[PDB]
Design a binder for this molecule. Structure first.
Ligand code: PC1
Ligand code: PC1
Ligand code: PC1
Ligand code: 3PE
Ligand code: 3PE
Ligand code: 3PE
Ligand code: 3PE
Ligand code: 3PE
Ligand code: 3PE
Ligand code: ZMP
Lengths: 13, 151, 53, 60, 48, 446, 144, 134, 50, 49, 107, 85, 81, 117
């Protein structure tokens, strides 16, 4: 709940 | 009977302990109790795994259950014999080297016979496995002589 | 509990009391005394000898 | 928790001195009473034979 | 006075401190398992 | 077990009704109460209705799984207050409880396999949805792939056994025995990875540190017990190949548990140390299973049930201090006795349960699993004494360094302990000290 | 702050990257000293501590964290478990080498084992012949 | 509001060697008259080497530290209430905000104390705003 | 699980077997006359395990 | 409890238990008897925990 | 080297004043949500403990550590177990011991 | 025990007047130990150790450099004993 | 610290141990400055001497013990001779 | 030092620890009486005497147990006759010493038997 997918996770795709 | 004051004091304390509990049993607990009958449960003899066929599973269940029940019965046979030896040890406190030697002989013979029937089968001991053990053991005592002599 | 609810032979899981033989000094009743229950079946009976079966 | 600086303790009560005399009297009374009534434990309960001047005719 | 402990310091160090087993049970012996616990981590928990 | 399964199947529509979280917990504890009153099971398969039945082994495993899932709802209150998809979480818990009951009530091995692989999906959902770190994606993928890579050839083994025997029933498969090496490796390697051997543990601390407490408790208390219950079913008909190939697994699972116990002395994470603690005690369980002695199987089942209870209880403590201190470690959580003095009693009562605690069922499982290993060989004595000595060296360091000493002096103000947390710790410890009075239901499954 | 943001990076291999790594760890550039990349090394992590203990550090310095004896953004030593105040740390340096204590203890034990088991066959005894017991058929006599 | 500085002088090193040597000397000798006699002897041994220059003083300081490492007592006398003693930090006092987490019925036992505490919270937030800013 | 009944049957089987000459634990699973005992020519080379 | 000290309460309880146990120990010397009681936990392979 | 000590002292003073400002905050304490003051060293230590594998290379020192640390005790311990059980199994199956003089009868 | 600032002042001045290298006259709480009196660098260690064996706690080396008069000696003792009255 | 003494009530020449260590230091040619600090210990009035403390330690209440012994001698002769 | 040291020096002279007599009795051919026991085995087992304390006068210990059970726990009234039991043990100990001394003399006779031929 504290961490959610950031745009840095979105960047690799 | 009161030989020493300590024994008389112990008799007095035992009487004070003994009085109210036997009064509560014989006056309260023993009245108002109904007389019901319970019986020790008795079992028939199912046919053994020798008469069972290879593909039959309805009779391997009965043979395995009576094998498990006979294993249980022999387990408290050995357990009762061990408690007989221990009660011999406590009751003959300075002379347990004479009185308990025949009881130890019956206990050792019972452990030897229990291991001959049930030993090395493992956790999953069916009636088939003990019968194969007995067949292989009787083959070994037919050919090579008794177990432990050699060959 | 320890007088009327002892570990009887019909069950497993009571407080099974095993007692030792009391000593007998001179001045006691029956000083020349052999130990009783010397039959092998009398040891660890737990009330089996008084069973109705 | 009384405290005294660069000096010894405060002067004690009557109870501690009376108790100290009671402890010393009880211990030394027990010790001297047992040295009087039972002096046999210190020296030895029985006299030790020498086993050197025994006659050869008695022992064979 | 002659300080005999200061003379036989090499003996009085051994006779005090409980014949060196407070050192033996605590320091130097426990280095061998605890360094070896890192070798499992560095090579087989997250290594090889 | 149709009444329990239909009870949970009509407990499913309570998730869609709002403000009913504690009602689902109350009825699941009622299921545990009824299942306490269903005890009449013995050795063979009893209460048979539509391919469902249990022996004493499966009775204890269903009772443990029901107790863990009800505690898991009690443990997870952060879902309720933040409203973090509590309906989906409740539905995941109830469906996973159905799948674990159905894989334990299986009379044939293929329902055990099918619902055993079905139970991997809500656990993966819990990992990927209700964690707190960016390494959730590393965690559920390790769990899913380390389970699946060895559980997929065991399906080929299952169909090889079915063609040879013609049935998957556990009693009809007990009569036969097989002398094939690759069949043995397929039917063993999935349980050897699912309950962690030292060479294949990797997925366990990754799945445990990342997982939410409602997700770490179902990995610690149960779902390693699937890999023990599978061997308790499978080793019955592969005894000769087990005598051919036990010694490598016994040697690996006894060297691990010493090396694993030396790992926990050199780690600082609170949740990772209990994660490696699950490896070491079920290293004893795995060593005791592959010796086919009667005491080995009985003490193995006892240590499965009791170790599941104490490991879930120890993972309960690692989330109480985590939500108050923000992040868990040894360094942050040093000396919590001066912060929560009443929590320290449960801390020691469950950390002592991880080692040999005197009136608990952990000791009774451990005292009879050592019997089989000592009776197996005398060479194993050297690496068992080091194993238990280092076991209580690490598991007393947990309570020792987390519950004693100077405070951190960098923490902020947090809430104190609540009625929910003490009740949660009580129902993990007092079952460990109360089921020893009838330990024959947790010893004798044969 | 997460594990992917704050993380030890690769081995620097550059003086500029070493300076940036020293600035990253709140460590003075002279202070920073990376692990040698031998397969078991720590890339982009300082080598700190490694004395005879954390207990060797002075307790009279006003530390920000007195329970670990460290400052606020001072980076943690790499083997902080092994060198902690629990295990294998001393206040003063030891008087002798590590082999001296074990050597003296095993020498004393070897001497005492040799002296005791050499004197095992010769034991002190009072001038007493034999304890007398009534087994049936002794026909044993006194000296009267 | 100063912290001790990590540099060390030669005067600091000679003073620390003198203090540690006298601590080891009083750990060796229990009685006060013998300790005072040996302290005057050590005072003469340290006063005889004052007239030497800096390099010989550094060499004598290193030799004295090495010899004090050689003759160090196995149990030196230390104060228990200070650091390094047995009675150091016998109890750990928690920070006062756990008193902020009491029950109101538990807070009712000390109402004047908790009202005084609220007044000092207002004073402390005023002090923190005027010291560390907003 | 039959444990109290097994204790009762243990006392009863020790009661009957002490009365007769039959030993307290039977060494054999069945009677050896029912054992077929195949000959050594019929076995040939077969693994016999004790 | 909240009016009486734990150290006193436990002291009175333990000294009464010690007096009772000494009075038990005096009876067992003159009797010279040993009482050994047991409670059955698990029966397994004719070995009783 | 004295200016290095002075620069380290200035950095330590800046970090000490930052710690005294942040650890003793009214407003961070007053939210009621517990936690930890932002420490870089603990986070770097945690991620060094977790994310260590990316600096591991196949080297003869690492191979020797993995060989004589884990694989070699497993190999000798498995060999000792196999040798002892093979000798005891040959003794047990040959017929050199009796049923009454046999260890570990589970009775 | 119970302490006050006048008791610490009386104790410090008493043990300083018992010191023979300092004269009993010309002794004040504001007097510097180095240049106002005849004590050298090594006698300050004896004064600090006398403070240690009187007040029961040991004093570090940098705190020994920080203390130069009886006034901050009284302030240093009153800090650890936490009197502040 | 309630009753601090003056600086004039401590004299080196009262205690014989300080006298003999000062005479030994005078033979050595050196002087001790802190010798006046230990005047309050070895004080013969409040504290005891070495010989009196040992006699009051080992033989304490021995007259009371001997009196109780003589009382038990006196009462034991009436009961059993 | 000690007698065991002489056992390292003269093995043919010194008998050793706990020695059997190794000789035909009545070598001096005097009127050696036969050691008899008043008590029998049945009341010895009834008194629960241990196997170590079954000496040739265990009936004095039996009377000591009777006086212990007659006055318990105040057992300081039998002390003198308790001493009587100890004197019997002392007499037994004297006989043991007698036998050992006789043993030494007989081995000394064996020494001049080595000078006989
Ligand atoms: C990878 C290696 C795969 C080897 C496959 C060999 C199968 C085989 O022997 O079949 C023929 C035999 C056939 O047995 P059979 O008795 O029916 O033989 C029939 C013989 N004829 C045709 C002449 C009538 O299979 C077996 O003996 C049983 C094998 C069961 C399992 C089959 C798949 C094995 C997969 C191995 C997985 C190992 C676990 C770890 C995995 C880790 C990741 C890879
Ligand atoms: C108030 C409640 C009173 C209950 C009561 O009467 O209890 C009596 C009973 C005994 O009486 P009982 O067993 O006859 O009573 C039960 C009877 N039935 C089954 C018919 C209902 O219990 C006890 O005395 C308590 C014994 C506790 C023993 C704990 C052993 C722990 C061992 C741990 C170490 C070994 C690990 C391996
Ligand atoms: C001897 C044991 C003495 C215990 C004294 C005591 O007050 O214990 C407090 C504890 C209870 O602590 P407590 O303070 O939590 O008690 C709650 C109840 N009030 C507050 C109302 C008193 O007592 C017990 O645990 C009693 C049960 C065990 C008693 C064993 C007696 C000896 C048996 C043999
Ligand atoms: C729990 C603490 C231990 C309790 C053990 C008690 C016990 O074992 O008692 C058994 C014993 C039986 O005495 P028994 O030989 O039957 O006497 C017949 C005459 O009974 C006794 O020994 C009881 C003795 C009571 C008198 C002495 C002690 C008095 C103090 C109060 C109790
Ligand atoms: C490899 C072979 C085996 C080796 C084994 C290990 C080593 C064994 C060493 C044996 C000798 C030990 C005793 C001597 C140690 C050296 C001397 C010494 O240091 O003495 C000084 C010490 C007190 O130190 P001190 O400096 O005086 O302190 C006060 C002032 N600073 O003084 C003391 O501590 C005094 C006490 C000494 C101990 C003896 C006390 C009892 C004396 C009587 C003993 C019994 C005699 C009769 C035995 C009869 C046996 C039948
Ligand atoms: C064998 C033991 C191997 C190591 C066991 C795991 C590590 C446990 C541990 O970290 O224990 C540390 C602790 C230190 O004890 P101590 O010497 O008092 O501490 C001062 C050091 N700063 O405690 C210990 O070192 C205790 C070691 C006990 C050894 C028992 C056998 C002695 C022979
Ligand atoms: C494994 C999970 C399988 C899929 C489950 C889907 C439903 C999960 C759930 O609990 O959804 C709750 C959700 C709340 O409603 P929401 O969509 O947020 O918006 C309100 C608009 N009606 O949505 C609802 O309440 C909608 C309810 C209708 C849709 C679900 C129908 C039943 C699905 C199967 C339930 C049984 C599971 C298998 C046994
Ligand atoms: C992933 C999990 C892996 C778990 C461990 C392996 C599990 C499978 C093992 C199979 C081998 C085995 O156990 O064989 C048993 C067999 C018994 O021997 P037996 O039948 O009596 O024949 C007489 C032999 N002379 O034994 C034999 O036949 C003896 C075999 C000897 C040759 C062994 C070769 C091992 C090579 C190294 C492997 C380990 C290291 C790998 C690299 C590590 C790098 C750090
Ligand atoms: C998954 C990640 C990687 C994991 C890597 C680690 C795997 C650990 C598990 C290893 C599995 C077991 C390996 C074999 C163990 C021994 C098996 C055995 O029983 O060997 C017995 C055999 C007997 O030898 P022999 O002399 O032939 O017999 C005479 C008997 N009358 O004795 C022998 O054959 C001894 C000779 C072979 C010994 C092999 C040792 C290998 C060590 C590592 C090598 C690495 C590569 C270089
Ligand atoms: C048990 C026995 C243990 C005894 C331990 C101590 C023995 C060591 C004695 C050996 C001689 C030494 O080590 S003296 C050490 C160096 N001393 C010096 O004074 C160095 C030269 N002097 C200076 O540099 C001085 O000018 C200052 C700068 C030290 C002047 O003094 P300040 O007024 O203190």
């Amino acid at each position: 709940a504290k961490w959610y997918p950031d745009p840095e996770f979105m960047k690799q795709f | 009977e009161p030989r020493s004051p300590m024994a008389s004091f112990a008799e007095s304390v035992l009487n004070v302990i003994d009085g109210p509990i036997t009064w509560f049993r014989e006056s309260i607990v023993e009245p108002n109790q109904q007389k019901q009958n319970w019986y020790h449960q008795r079992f028939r003899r199912v046919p053994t795994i020798d008469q069972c066929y290879t593909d039959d599973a309805v009779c391997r269940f009965e043979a395995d259950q009576q094998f498990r029940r006979d294993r249980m019965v022999d387990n408290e046979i050995v357990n009762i014999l061990r408690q007989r030896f221990e009660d011999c040890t406590l009751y003959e406190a300075p002379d347990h080297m004479v009185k308990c030697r025949p009881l130890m002989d019956q206990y050792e013979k019972a452990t030897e016979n229990w291991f001959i029937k049930y030993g090395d089968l493992g956790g999953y001991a069916n009636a088939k496995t003990a019968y194969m053990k007995q067949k292989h053991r009787l083959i070994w005592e037919r050919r090579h002589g008794p177990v432990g002599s050699g060959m | 509990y320890f007088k009327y609810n002892q570990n009887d032979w019909t069950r497993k899981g009571g407080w099974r009391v095993i007692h030792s033989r009391k000593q007998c000094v001179p001045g006691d009743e029956g000083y020349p005394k052999v130990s009783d229950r010397s039959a092998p079946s009398d040891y660890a009976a737990r009330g089996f000898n008084e069973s109705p079966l | 928790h009384v405290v005294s600086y660069r000096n010894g303790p405060p002067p004690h009560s009557k109870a501690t001195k009376i108790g100290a005399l009671t402890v010393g009297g009880a211990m030394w009374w027990w010790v001297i009473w047992h040295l009087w009534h039972e002096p046999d434990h210190i020296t030895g309960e029985f006299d030790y034979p020498n086993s050197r001047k025994w006659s050869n005719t008695e022992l064979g | 006075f002659l300080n005999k402990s200061l003379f036989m310091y090499n003996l009085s160090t051994f006779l005090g401190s409980m014949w060196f087993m407070p050192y033996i049970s605590t320091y130097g012996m426990i280095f061998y398992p605890l360094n070896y616990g890192q070798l499992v981590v560095k090579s087989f928990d997250q290594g090889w | 077990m149709l009444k329990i399964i239909f009870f949970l199947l009509f407990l499913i529509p309570f998730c869609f009704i709002n403000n009913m979280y504690w009602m689902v917990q109350i009825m699941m504890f009622f299921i545990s109460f009824i299942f306490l009153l269903m005890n009449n099971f013995m050795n063979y398969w009893s209460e048979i209705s539509y391919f469902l039945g249990c022996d004493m082994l499966s009775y204890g495993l269903i009772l443990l799984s029901l107790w863990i899932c009800s505690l898991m709802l009690l443990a997870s209150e952060m879902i309720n207050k933040h409203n973090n998809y509590k309906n989906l979480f409740l539905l995941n818990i109830i469906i996973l409880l159905l799948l674990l009951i159905l894989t334990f009530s299986s009379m044939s091995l293929f329902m055990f396999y099918l619902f055993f692989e079905s139970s991997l999906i809500p656990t993966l959902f819990l990992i990927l949805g209700w964690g707190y770190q960016p390494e959730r994606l590393q965690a559920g993928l390790y769990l899913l792939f380390y389970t699946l890579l060895v559980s997929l050839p065991m399906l080929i083994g299952i169909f090889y056994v079915m063609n040879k025997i013609g049935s998957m029933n556990f009693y009809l498969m007990n009569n036969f025995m097989f002398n094939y090496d690759l069949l043995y490796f397929c039917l063993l390697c999935a349980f050897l990875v699912k309950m962690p051997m030292f060479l294949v543990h990797l997925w366990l601390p990754k799945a445990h540190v990342e997982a939410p407490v409602s997700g770490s408790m179902i990995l610690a208390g149960i779902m390693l017990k699937l890999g023990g219950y599978g061997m308790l079913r499978v080793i019955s008909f592969l005894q000769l190949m087990n005598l051919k190939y036990s010694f490598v697994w016994i040697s690996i699972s006894l060297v691990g548990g010493v090396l694993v116990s030396l790992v926990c002395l050199r780690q600082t994470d609170l949740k990772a140390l209990i994660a490696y603690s699950s490896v070491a005690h079920m290293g004893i369980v795995l060593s005791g299973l592959l010796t086919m002695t009667y005491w080995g199987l009985c003490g193995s089942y006892t240590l499965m049930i009791a170790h599941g209870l104490c490991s879930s209880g120890l993972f309960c403590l690692a989330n109480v201090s985590y939500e108050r201190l923000g992040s868990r470690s040894m360094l942050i959580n040093k000396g919590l006795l001066n912060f929560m003095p009443s929590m320290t009693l449960w801390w020691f009562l469950l950390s002592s349960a991880n080692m040999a605690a005197p009136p608990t069922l952990n000791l009774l499982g451990e005292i009879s699993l050592l019997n089989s290993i000592v009776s197996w060989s005398w060479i194993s004595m050297i690496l068992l004494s080091f194993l238990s000595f280092f076991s209580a060296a690490y598991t007393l360091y947990l309570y020792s360094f987390s519950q004693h000493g100077k405070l951190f002096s960098g923490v902020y103000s947090f809430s104190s302990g609540k009625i929910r947390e003490y009740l949660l710790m009580l129902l993990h410890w007092l079952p460990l000290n109360l089921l020893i009075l009838k330990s024959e239901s947790f010893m004798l499954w044969l | 702050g997460w594990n992917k943001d704050y993380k030890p990076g690769p081995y620097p291999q550059t003086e500029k990257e070493r300076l940036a790594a020293a600035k990253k760890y709140y460590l003075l550039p002279e202070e920073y000293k990376p692990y040698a990349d031998d397969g078991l090394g720590y890339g982009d992590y300082p080598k700190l501590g490694y004395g005879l203990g954390v207990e060797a550090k002075d307790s009279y310095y006003p530390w920000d964290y007195p329970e670990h004896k460290r400052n606020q953004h001072e980076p943690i030593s790499a083997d902080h478990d092994l060198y902690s105040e629990d295990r294998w740390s001393q206040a003063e340096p030891p008087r002798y080498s590590n082999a001296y204590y074990f050597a003296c203890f095993l020498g004393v034990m070897s001497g005492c084992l040799a002296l005791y088991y050499w004197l095992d066959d010769k034991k002190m005894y009072r001038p007493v012949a034999a304890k007398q017991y009534p087994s049936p058929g002794v026909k044993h006599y006194t000296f009267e | 509001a100063q912290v001790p500085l990590a540099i060390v002088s030669h005067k600091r090193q000679v003073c620390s060697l003198y203090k540690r040597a006298l601590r080891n000397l009083e750990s060796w000798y229990d009685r006060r008259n013998v300790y005072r006699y040996r302290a005057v002897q050590l005072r003469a041994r340290f006063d005889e080497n004052r007239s030497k220059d800096l390099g010989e003083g550094i060499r004598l300081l290193a030799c004295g530290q090495r010899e004090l490492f050689e003759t160090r007592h196995f149990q030196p006398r230390n104060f228990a209430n200070s650091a390094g003693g047995c009675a150091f930090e016998r109890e750990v006092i928690p920070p006062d905000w756990v008193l902020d987490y009491w029950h109101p019925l538990e807070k009712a036992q000390y109402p004047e104390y908790f009202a005084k505490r609220e007044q000092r919270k207002k004073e402390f937030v005023t002090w923190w705003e005027k010291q560390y800013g907003k | 699980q039959f444990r109290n009944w097994a204790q009762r049957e243990g006392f009863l089987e020790l009661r009957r077997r002490e009365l007769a000459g039959v030993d307290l634990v039977s060494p054999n699973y069945v009677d050896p006359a029912s054992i077929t005992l195949p000959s050594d020519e019929d076995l040939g080379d077969t693994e016999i395990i004790i | 409890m909240k009016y009486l000290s734990i150290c006193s309460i436990s002291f009175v309880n333990l000294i009464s238990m010690s007096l009772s146990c000494f009075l038990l120990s005096l009876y067992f010397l003159l009797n010279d008897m040993i009482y050994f009681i047991e409670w059955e936990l698990v029966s397994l392979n004719s070995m009783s925990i | 080297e004295q200016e290095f000590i002075k620069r380290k002292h200035e950095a330590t003073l800046k970090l000490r004043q930052e710690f005294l400002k942040q650890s003793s905050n009214p407003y961070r304490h007053a939210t009621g949500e517990g936690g930890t003051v932002f420490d870089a060293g603990l986070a770097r230590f945690q991620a060094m403990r977790v994310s260590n594998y990316e600096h591991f290379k196949p080297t003869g020192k690492s191979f020797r550590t993995g060989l004589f640390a884990v694989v070699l005790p497993i190999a000798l311990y498995a060999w000792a177990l196999k040798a002892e059980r093979d000798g005891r199994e040959e003794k047990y199956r040959t017929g050199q011991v009796a049923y009454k003089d046999r260890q570990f009868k589970f009775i | 025990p119970p302490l006050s600032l006048k008791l610490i002042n009386e104790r410090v001045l008493l043990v300083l007047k018992l010191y023979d290298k300092i004269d009993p006259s010309k002794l004040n709480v504001e007097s510097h130990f180095i240049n106002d009196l005849g004590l050298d660098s090594l006698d300050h260690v004896e004064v600090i150790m006398a403070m240690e064996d009187e007040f029961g706690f040991e004093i570090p080396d940098s705190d020994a450099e920080k203390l130069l008069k009886p006034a901050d000696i009284i302030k240093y003792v009153a800090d650890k004993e936490d009197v502040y009255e | 610290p309630y009753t601090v003494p003056h600086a004039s009530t401590y004299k080196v020449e009262s205690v014989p141990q300080l006298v003999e260590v000062k005479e030994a230091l005078g033979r050595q040619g050196l002087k001790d400055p802190w010798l006046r600090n230990e005047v309050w210990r070895y004080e013969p009035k409040a504290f005891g001497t070495h010989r009196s403390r040992l006699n009051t330690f080992l033989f304490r209440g021995l007259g009371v013990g001997f009196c109780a012994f003589l009382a038990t001698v006196a009462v034991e002769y009436a009961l059993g001779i | 030092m000690g007698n065991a040291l002489t056992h390292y020096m003269k093995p043919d002279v010194m008998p050793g620890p706990d020695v059997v007599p190794t000789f035909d009795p009545l070598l001096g051919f005097k009127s050696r009486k036969e050691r008899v026991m008043i008590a029998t085995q049945e009341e010895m087992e009834s008194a629960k005497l241990p196997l170590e304390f079954r000496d040739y006068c265990a009936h004095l210990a039996i009377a000591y147990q009777a006086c212990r059970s007659d006055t318990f726990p105040f057992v300081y009234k039998c002390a003198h006759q308790k001493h009587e039991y100890l004197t019997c043990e002392y007499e037994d100990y004297v006989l043991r010493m007698k036998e050992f001394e006789r043993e030494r003399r007989l081995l000394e006779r064996q020494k001049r038997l080595n000078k006989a031929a």
